[PDB]
Amino acid sequence: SLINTKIKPFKNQAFKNGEFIEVTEKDTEGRWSVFFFYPADFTFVCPTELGDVADHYEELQKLGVDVYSVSTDTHFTHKAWHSSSETIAKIKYAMIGDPTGALTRNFDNMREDEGLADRATFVVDPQGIIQAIEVTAEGIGRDASDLLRKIKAAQYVAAHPGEVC
Amino acid sequence: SLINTKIKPFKNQAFKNGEFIEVTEKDTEGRWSVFFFYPADFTFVCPTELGDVADHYEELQKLGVDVYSVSTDTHFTHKAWHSSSETIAKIKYAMIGDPTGALTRNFDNMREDEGLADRATFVVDPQGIIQAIEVTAEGIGRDASDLLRKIKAAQYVAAHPGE
Amino acid sequence: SLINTKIKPFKNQAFKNGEFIEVTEKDTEGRWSVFFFYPADFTFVCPTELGDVADHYEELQKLGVDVYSVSTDTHFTHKAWHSSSETIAKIKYAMIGDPTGALTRNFDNMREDEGLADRATFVVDPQGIIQAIEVTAEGIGRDASDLLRKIKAAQYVAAHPGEVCP
Amino acid sequence: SLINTKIKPFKNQAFKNGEFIEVTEKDTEGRWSVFFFYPADFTFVCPTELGDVADHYEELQKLGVDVYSVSTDTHFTHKAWHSSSETIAKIKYAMIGDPTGALTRNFDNMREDEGLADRATFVVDPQGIIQAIEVTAEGIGRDASDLLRKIKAAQYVAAHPGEVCPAK
């Protein structure tokens, strides 16, 4: 896996709280980042995973953690899904559009025969190193709580290196 | 250009009049087909080109012509857009989703740096031969009327070899 | 397609209003251009398409739009065809000869089997970018009227960038 | 990642309750399996993750789930570690030895510059398909209860497809 490797440069358009912005790796430098990948906007499954993360967003920002959800849809589609779904509407973090599939391929998370990203979550530290990876098949939910636990644990480890036992 | 070449095999999902279906080159054999490519669903450009083709869909079905609109979005996104835009709601032809971009690259119509298709239209005869091609930059609309004209002329020619 | 790409350098001989001139990409820089390819001079096909463009040439020149018809025939052949056909004689725009096929191939418009160019039209802006492409099989006609509308729309968006939908 | 791909064939020796057995992919067919990778036996870090999984092994087995812990150490070393650690002693599932690193590389889980496996867990279904993947850096712990939840969800979805919450 990509565990313990440095993220790659990227440049994508995103939808964030009613506005379109540009996100690059420069924007992640010096902060804790979560790249949350999912297959596609507007499908028939409920966005509970994305919603669960939105429910814990405020707490994640306290920890200084930025969140970026990613799918191969465009940021335009994201804006429309954001105003058509009650759950998605709760999202205040950036929703990156990756139509070229480059961000998704950077994380080796592309299903090439579908052109859609897999259900993968990556935790990245301030130096751009992946400290936690979680991948799941459809129906096996990614728990935002366990995600918070891992991040706190990863932040703890960075402050207290070599934790003897 | 691809003028006068045979279209390639393809298998994509699509939204058509409320239902999701599969489309392949096999569904085009024996028919006149129009492949209408555009950049993306839900942007801020007026969907007049798509709606205009819809206004003429009635007439095209009479000439035995099928219409397939194509973008790199999913069929799911087409369904959503079809319920959001009054102009898109008029569409009764198949809206093909090409998330992998394979259908788009078949017609050598991909902007690789954007992951979206260029505004291209192709007219294909019953034998899979591209008989007319039209491509324009954004802001320069495609006229549905001119399309119908080209299609009738294309049909004449096939039944009245060289005059 | 070649949509949104810059035209490539070229150098050909042409017939324009009784004389032989040389055209290069230099002449198109800073101007709007229409490259109108066709298969061949002196064929039994009605020159209706070329004359049709001639009919709109005055308005095109008024709009800063140059026109260049192109075929793999020589510029010598164009002179003859021009003083031979009532329709072709109406043409005041340059008639480029492309016997090496280079100009035609720059636009990826060659029917390699016949050594003749396909029936394609290209609209190029002052910076050399292709903004509109049209290609048709023999017998399917190009409407000069449609070309005019497109050219105007092209000029419009160059002047009014990112005009969102009202 | 390896999500949704089929596990590759393998043949390793392991230590299972005072015994040395062989384990191959055939042993996993028609069963639910958890492949638990860790870097090394006998190190200073508390074998917390290994023990937590040991505690929930009763439950896992009730669910028809087999567990295999894996490291590049040999089975001989696992047997020794199992005799000296109170925590490791409570392990009743198979402890696979992967000295050639073939098993580890099959799951693309090798830290090449160390010759040790990364902290990664893989849930594999009866047809050998990887349904869940978890990888963490040293210090970040893997929660066995979170694993149990995922396993039950994977079984539920296998048994009842499409019963996924409908949108609006």
Add this chain to the structure above:
Amino acid sequence: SLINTKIKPFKNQAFKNGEFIEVTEKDTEGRWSVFFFYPADFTFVCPTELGDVADHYEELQKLGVDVYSVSTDTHFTHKAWHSSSETIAKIKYAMIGDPTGALTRNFDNMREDEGLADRATFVVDPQGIIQAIEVTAEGIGRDASDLLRKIKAAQYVAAHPGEVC
């Protein structure tokens, strides 16, 4: 040079006395053929070479020789030229159009710089073998009568195999 090699197959359209026809290598088998290449139709240069050949045409046809003029122009353009030029209208032999340049290239006679054939004449016997070659720069003329001499001698040497001194 191509001297003493067999001509390559070809298929071209041509103009021959009011009508359009198709010439192919098969139309040369068992016959003496002369391929006369020239740069271009409707030029400002005197059509002398082609005309001086039309004159000796009855004679040539008698010796069992066929004449094929070749240019990279189309056959449509040939018809037109054999109607606006007095000298050209005297041509009873086939005027081949070679817009793809294949026939010219078969004879290695293309001026790649211009997409026009060079001033070259070839003599091909019934077996498809080139027995005489003549290439001239624009300006020097190709003597029609001398061509006839070559054909006579070529025709003799063919009848009375290498006659020692």
Add this chain to the structure above:
Amino acid sequence: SLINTKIKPFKNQAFKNGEFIEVTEKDTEGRWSVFFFYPADFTFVCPTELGDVADHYEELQKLGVDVYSVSTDTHFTHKAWHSSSETIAKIKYAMIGDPTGALTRNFDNMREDEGLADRATFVVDPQGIIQAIEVTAEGIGRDASDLLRKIKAAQYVAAHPGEVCPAK
């Protein structure tokens, strides 16, 4: 074979008398060294070869010869093995851990299909040159006295070149 070639650079962890130290080729410069490779710690075969070398370690040290036993196990495992085997307990020289198999491959001594080192001994002189090589299949023992003889011969020849018996 690697006879008469210079040893390659290396950096490994080892267990030396209750401690964990690092060992690199720099540690061997200006010294005589014996690199003793074996397949695995904690296995069933009697650690005879390892102990025999342990017994003669006093003598070896009197001669200015350092000993390094090597296996693809980790140093952590060597420390554990050193605490449970009476024979291994008498080892006072460094026990190098080579989990990435880099040291082992430097001496071209890896059984690739097992990820374990072959039974091979290498005598390296002060300038890092390999002067003697010995490799045996499992079951065929390496004699520490035969090793001592070779080492003394290697030192004698280094000190007195050409003093080799004259022919007739």
Add this chain to the structure above:
Amino acid sequence: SLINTKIKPFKNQAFKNGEFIEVTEKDTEGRWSVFFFYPADFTFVCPTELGDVADHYEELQKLGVDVYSVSTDTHFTHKAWHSSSETIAKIKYAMIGDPTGALTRNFDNMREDEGLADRATFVVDPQGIIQAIEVTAEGIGRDASDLLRKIKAAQYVAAHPGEVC
């Protein structure tokens, strides 16, 4: 064909009226040269072509033209032949020996099958440009007088640049 290209450099030995000399491309610069290739010395075929050229030699030398006969035989063999054959002894121009086949190959005139040059004549102007080419199969003759015509016209066209019709 090589029509209208610049001759390539070369260095060869040759026989010219009782003595041996060295001809090189430099000896052609600023001069009109005729390269006359023939298969082989001491053959059983009439040396007519070479002899018919010797006759017009005074004339040619007057028009500022140099003549070089070329064969893959050595120059030693040329001296010998210009002593046992009456026709050959009339030659005042340089007889070049081309045993390596380089000169023949420069002019793409080698019959690789036999290691002998084909019957070809080339006209090169002072700038080293080939203006006329003639290749003939063994048997057909190369008209010496016609060669002269070509030279005259070639020489004219060079003086009075392309004179339109």
Add this chain to the structure above:
Amino acid sequence: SLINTKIKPFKNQAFKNGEFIEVTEKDTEGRWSVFFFYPADFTFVCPTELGDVADHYEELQKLGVDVYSVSTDTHFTHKAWHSSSETIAKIKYAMIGDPTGALTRNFDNMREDEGLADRATFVVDPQGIIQAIEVTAEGIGRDASDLLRKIKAAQYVAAHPGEVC
């Protein structure tokens, strides 16, 4: 090392008790073999190693062990060294000549810049598998006794596989 690999096919001439014979791998099948490599015949160092082996030859034949000494010299040289040196004279085993260096290269025992083999000894079982390897620099003697010990140990192991301890 080559430990535990199968020897490669070979075919060399050898000198054995006054006679020249041919040795191939077929000759080793079903028996225990010792390939004793050394740099060169007639040097100034004493052949004690080869002599020590000769002293233990009889005992090695009892164990069913064949011995083949090898150097890149020819078998002719071997015959002469055998009758010039008292020590070599004691040798009753085969002395293989390997002038092409193939046997030596088969065992990866060549010093390429010298064209001489290294001081390497290989013990090969009846199935052609190398069970013991010993390599030594000049002056560090190979002890025939330790060699006998290893062979007996290897023969024991083959009769009593998996010797528990």
Add this chain to the structure above:
Amino acid sequence: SLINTKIKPFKNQAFKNGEFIEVTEKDTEGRWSVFFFYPADFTFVCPTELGDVADHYEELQKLGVDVYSVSTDTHFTHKAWHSSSETIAKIKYAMIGDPTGALTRNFDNMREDEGLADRATFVVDPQGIIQAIEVTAEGIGRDASDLLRKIKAAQYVAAHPGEVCP
């Protein structure tokens, strides 16, 4: 060198006693052959070497040894040189012409700079194996006497294999 290799197939024209014949490797099979290469006919060098071979030809034929002189000159040139030189006229063996250089290259004996063959002699046995090679720079002469001794020795060992030293 080519020592102990089999000659390669070949096909050339030669002049032999007033006529033109064709020689191939077929003619050498079953016989002993001497291929005597030299640089050129009609040169100012004394033909002493070729005539020297002529002088021993009768004894060579008596021994079953054919001889072939070879140069890149044509067989036509050989005829002339033969009826022109008192020395060359003594030759009754075939004089091969190798203008393509193929025969000469088969024996790796070409001076690529001059297009002429080097002064080399090759002795070929009935099975096509080269048993003796001799090459010299211009001016260093080949002794026909030495060639004869070698040929005899060659024939001797073919008849008496592995003759150890007395």
Add this chain to the structure above:
Amino acid sequence: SLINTKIKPFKNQAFKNGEFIEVTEKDTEGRWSVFFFYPADFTFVCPTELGDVADHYEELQKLGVDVYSVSTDTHFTHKAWHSSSETIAKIKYAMIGDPTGALTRNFDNMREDEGLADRATFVVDPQGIIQAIEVTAEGIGRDASDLLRKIKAAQYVAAHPGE
């Protein structure tokens, strides 16, 4: 053949009149050299070729010619053979050992399947140019007299360019 080409650089050990020395192409510069290759020392073929060259060594040293015999054996073997064969004992020129075969391959004279050199002699002038080459199969002896003759002629030619 290698006729008229320049010899290549080489460094070999040799036995010469009781002593071991090193020989390189540098030792040949400015002198006439004879490289005499043969298969192997100690075989059963009469060493007449080598002894014959020895008989003429005296005379060759006068013409300023060095002689180097070469085989793929070591210099050690040459020393031994020089003490065993009465014919070889007459040799006062350098006997080069070419165990790696590099000197032999330089003169493209190796029988690769045997690891021995073919019976070849090469005459090299002061500038390293091979002026005469002679190769024969076993049983067909090389005549030392003919060699001397070739060498004198070679020397004449170098001082009397083309005659």
